[PDB]
Symmetry: D2
Subunit: 321 residues, 4 copies
């Protein structure tokens, strides 16, 4: 904090080291929500659920998972002991102690959509490929699940973005938590979307649109639009234009504490559309604003080895293929 022989820097933040973080259970978990990728995961699902119940724990699954014809007379005993919820009708946000994901892709996106406030710890398993969000192998799953419950497992606090859509009626405000990104794209050539950073007009996006992503979302849609692969321990917000009219408009990475305000330019002839992790697509009209900030509710991803090692392994596998 000393700069040369006479100067120094004089507000102080208290953050735990992202590389040293571990999970703690104030009380032993009892309710577990199981999420599986929407056929190879049928036997692992059946095996996991039987184990969790034999370990005296209430298992939650979406109603549609048990409706699948593949889900068996032998599994009937377990099938009857499940706690089911309906995705579009039921709120299980405050009922779940722990989350287990079977398979990759949108399992963690789906977990994030169910938990729009505090997110319970997430243990993600891979069956097919390693991916970036599923570090655990299903081999010796019983001992690993036990070590996560009984021990102090390492975690990556995968940041999320808080997205507030204010629409003129009074006014109506809608809040969304995105794990990967928030896309603002043109309606059916040139969008006219104004991007403000901490109150400063940064630019008017003219092109297909803009992706505002988290380091977790750096391997998602933004990757395809020219963004960098960002380790989930890097505190930042990424702004990636989609097919910009100005080729000089390169992807941008800003500090996690900035506030983004996105709205249609007053001169905008056409409307724009906003999407939250590819879901809940809705129109942005004149007078409507989208405010993006880093959420105070990150997704706690449990680790196999540690935050750095797990991502490096996923990167090494990514660059081997």
């Amino acid at each position: 904090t000393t700069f040369g022989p006479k100067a120094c820097v004089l507000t102080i933040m208290h953050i735990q080291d992202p590389a040293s973080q571990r999970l703690t259970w104030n009380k032993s978990p009892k309710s577990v929500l199981v999420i599986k990728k929407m056929a190879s995961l049928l036997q692992p699902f059946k095996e996991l659920c039987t184990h969790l119940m034999e370990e005296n724990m209430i298992v939650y699954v979406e109603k549609k998972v048990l409706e699948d014809p593949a889900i068996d007379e032998s599994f009937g005993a377990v099938k009857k002991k499940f706690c089911t919820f309906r995705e579009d009708y039921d709120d299980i946000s405050n009922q779940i102690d722990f989350i287990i994901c079977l398979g990759g892709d949108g399992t963690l996106l789906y977990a994030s959509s169910l938990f729009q406030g505090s997110v319970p710890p997430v243990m993600a398993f891979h069956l097919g490929s390693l991916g970036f969000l599923t570090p655990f192998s299903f081999e010796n799953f019983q001992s690993q699940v036990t070590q996560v419950i009984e021990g102090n497992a390492a975690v990556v606090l995968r940041s999320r973005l808080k997205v507030r859509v204010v629409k003129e009626l009074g006014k109506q405000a809608m809040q969304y938590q995105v794990l990967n990104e928030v896309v603002i794209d043109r309606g059916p050539y040139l969008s006219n979307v104004d991007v403000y950073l901490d109150g400063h007009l940064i630019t008017t996006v003219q092109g297909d649109g803009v992706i505002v992503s988290t380091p977790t979302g750096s391997t998602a849609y933004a990757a395809a639009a020219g963004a960098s692969m960002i380790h989930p321990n890097v505190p930042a917000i990424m702004i990636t234009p989609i097919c910009p009219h100005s080729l000089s408009f390169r992807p941008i990475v800003v500090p996690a504490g900035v506030e983004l305000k996105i709205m249609l330019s007053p001169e905008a002839r056409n409307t724009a559309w906003v999407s939250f992790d590819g879901r809940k697509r809705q129109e942005i009209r004149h007078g409507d604003s989208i405010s993006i900030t880093t959420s105070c509710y990150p997704l706690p991803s449990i680790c196999v080895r540690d935050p750095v090692s797990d991502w490096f392994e996923s990167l090494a596998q990514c660059l081997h293929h």
Copy 2:
């Protein structure tokens, strides 16, 4: 600052202790020595140095600056020219003699300041005359009052990389980047990149750039990297014209240790550069270790860390 509770039963159990957007400069003692680093700049150089001396301060400059016939022929500036405290770039170490640095003109003035201060760096106040750039936020108009205001200020702590080359061990502090390229070799490079001891990949292409957020607007930008705000703690790995098009630029946490060396199967040698200078050959068995330096470059703001960068981007776009 995230909520540390995860659902109804879990939470997180090493604790680190300043907001990068709220940082300001403090003088334990008033500055007495200023280092000035700089044809369009000749009159503002004379103007500034006459002002700094009139404000009772020892002004340091490199010997070659005063050797210039534009400075040497000026008889009026002969009184000031004699009062400067000179140093020789390659022979003299002024690292612990300078209290504050002033840069005239853009480009490699900050790179040059970084090379002179391989330990703690005094605060840098950079002026632009031509274009705004990304590292020169101050306008030379009303400089007298601006400098008075800086002495009697907001700052960005621009991180640097600590580079260790073992072939004999050599240490270098780089402000922008360290480039490892194939040099005169036609054949694609065979550079092994290790992150915290883990072999990530073998770079096959023109090479790899390992940069700081400050260096993101430099060479890495041209190689497909993102523009990273200097308040983001991170190290960047950008391949140069990679053979695999899927090999995207990478941004890693500031606390990782990078190890770069030739692949055992490498038929040709690689070359390492430090902020474009001190180019040298990398042979088999030689290693380049890269970590974030504990000595960042303190760049003084015209407005604030966020606003300054946004305007440099507004001018860029």
Copy 3:
């Protein structure tokens, strides 16, 4: 002239059915079999800077005893409607309705005021043979507007009375079979996803890939400075015979833009596994859904757009490129 002998013993047989007879793309000139009488004037919409040049050019063309056509909506604009001086001229225009009237065989040559969509709007009106297009720039040079409005009278006269140079800007013929519909595009045909696309791309009957990404742009060398430019394509001189296939934000980063010969036939359709529908658009217009079983067949049109040159096809593009890289 390439040497047709390959080493001491081999060569390529120079057969009459293999030798093509193409007019030099760099040496082409315009000829009037009869003097033009009708002119179509197209001006960039909602640009106030073009109002005075429009009125000036229209007054001149009529004073040169010629029927000046404009779309009805152009004269409806309050900027034109409020001007009392332009009344005499305003009454002498032949107006047509964009969506109702076919002026394809009534127009002798076209004049464009400003860049952007002016030329693609001309292409949409002429789905068969296209009359000569003389495009003017007011703001920046651009790539499709070579003429300066300074001394326009003499230039318009030189184009009518002389043998002006031309670039035959190729177009694509697009057949949509859902019922068959035919479209001519100057720049591109975009096949994009609805709110991961699963669009199959066939080249001369061969399935090349399934596009998982935002979609695909199939463009002409003229379209290379348009939408495809923003999606990572190259700038292609309009005298280069080719079809461009540019993916939009592909899932596979290794999927680079592709340039194929002008004589290939592209067939685009939804992959059998496509859960969502795709959308096809023609120079950003006439957007329509693509369902399972529907096909889009793309070939080079036999009706290219004749763009009049200030100097020549090569010189004009080089000048536009030099100005493009100066900015």
Copy 4:
């Protein structure tokens, strides 16, 4: 062709060009081939058995087989006692010392990558027909599978095989005038200079831009899958007549890759204000310094490389593209 109701383009004999259809070209032997040059990919053990098999067959078919001296020096070839009889019957040449340009009737390449580059460097005039085999992956320049090679080699010798005439660039370096033929590209880079390059690019005498970056790649459609691919260029079918100009890590992000007509003349030289020197490479070989006053003139060569086809120019490339996008 007509353009609207009254205009057309004058079809003049001095304007009409007589170009061979690139899709219809086939190989003809004026005399049966006797001397074959065999080129195999360096540091690849998988090609050793195919090499031995091929060279035993060619000699059994009473033909003189040429190989570079270093190929037979390899311990894998040198130790094999069974291959000794064939090893003694080869005509060896020394790469940089011997000129075999007028001794070879036919070229066979084993494996991809630099094999065709190496063939091109040996034949700076007329190039004998090239039959390229793939063992590992299909690639873009090796269409033949080594399975049933005997019958394929015979069909190429006894028949009228289809051919792609892969254009080359003629490069004249005046620094003393030297001439070079490149199959893929000519690179002009900043070399060891920390400072951004200052390379002036002229197209048909017109100064287009000053490249300030790592440098510029001037490539052929064949070279589009080589170095230029890595620098942001498009994949161009080898039947597209064109020259490609791709900047390497340009200082201006707006500087996109460019595709120009095959008949343009490029002149590259240092900007008068250039503080540092540039370096010119020819297919990654013969690297040399470019000082003030030195010029590089690039045009399409009159000696293209005749690549023999498995099926045809279009089909072969589409298959290579389909395999490229499958991986």
